[PDB]
Amino acid sequence: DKEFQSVEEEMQSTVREHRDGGHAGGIFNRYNILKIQKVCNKKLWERYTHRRKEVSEENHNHANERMLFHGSPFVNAIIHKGFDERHAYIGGMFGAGIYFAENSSKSNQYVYGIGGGTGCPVHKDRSCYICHRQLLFCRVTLGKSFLQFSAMKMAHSPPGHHSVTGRPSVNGLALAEYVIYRGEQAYPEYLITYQIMRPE
Numbered sequence: 675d676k677e678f679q680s681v682e683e684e685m686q687s688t689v690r691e692h693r694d695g696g697h698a699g700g701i702f703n704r705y706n707i708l709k710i711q712k713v714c715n716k717k718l719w720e721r722y723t724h725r726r727k728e729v730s731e732e733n734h735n736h737a738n739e740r741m742l743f744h745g746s747p748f749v750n751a752i753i754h755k756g757f758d759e760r761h762a763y764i765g766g767m768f769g770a771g772i773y774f775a776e777n778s779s780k781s782n783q784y785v786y787g788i789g790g791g792t793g794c795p796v797h798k799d800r801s802c803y804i805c806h807r808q809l810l811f812c813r814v815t816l817g818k819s820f821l822q823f824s825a826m827k828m829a830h831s832p833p834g835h836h837s838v839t840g841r842p843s844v845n846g847l848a849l850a851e852y853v854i855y856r857g858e859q860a861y862p863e864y865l866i867t868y869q870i871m872r873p874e
């Protein structure tokens with residue numbers, strides 16, 4: 675499957691060297707991709723496309739849809755129930771929203787919790803090369819995205835906007851991040867099962 679090869683390439687090619695020296699997500703340059711599953715949840719897809727059409731109509735017939743990563747210990751609840759802003763990241767740089775990265779390694783830092791939590795459930799290792807990790811590769815409707823550089827605790831998107839784009843800056847973000855404030859503005863399209871690999 676070329677669809678799956680495209681997802682593996684997005685995963686591999688978006689890895690970056692993290693400022694924390696791998697404290698949160700581990701030390702690696704690449705992954706061992708074990709499985710890529712397409713999520714087909716008709717109810718979630720209908721909620722997503724219904725919202726995507728509304729946002730498109732409010733944004734000059736353009737949804738501004740992107741494929742983005744999301745790492746979380748709650749990936750299995752997300753696949754069944756969808757992203758839920760009632761469980762949004764309050765402590766987040768851009769307030770109470772649902773957060774995504776365009777770099778797979780940034781999302782990998784959240785797979786076991788904030789700052790990688792205590793790592794894998796079995797070895798309590800944030801850099802575990804044994805335990806199988808899971809990330810989501812999502813369809814996200816950004817619509818009219820508010821470009822922001824510094825911390826801005828929002829409860830909802832700014833007036834006239836459908837999302838917030840956190841752009842990198844000198845005394846700010848190392849890498850981009852994308853925030854939606856409505857769970858129906860993202861669809862968890864692919865569930866990726868993988869391992870981070872020990873460097874060569």
Ligand SMILES: O=C(c1cc(Cc2n[nH]c(=O)c3ccccc23)ccc1F)N1CCN(C(=O)C2CC2)CC1
Pocket residue numbers: 743744745746748751752756757758759761762763771772773774775780781782784788851852
């Ligand atoms: O957006 C968050 C969230 C994000 C984060 C940070 C984060 N988590 N994952 C990322 O991939 C990421 C990428 C760039 C910047 C930050 C992140 C932390 C706690 C959170 F609750 N959600 C929590 C998990 N979600 C749910 O619907 C849970 C299942 C009930 C979706 C929304």
Ligand SMILES: [Zn+2]
Pocket residue numbers: 794795796797798799802803804805
């Ligand atoms: Zn482990």
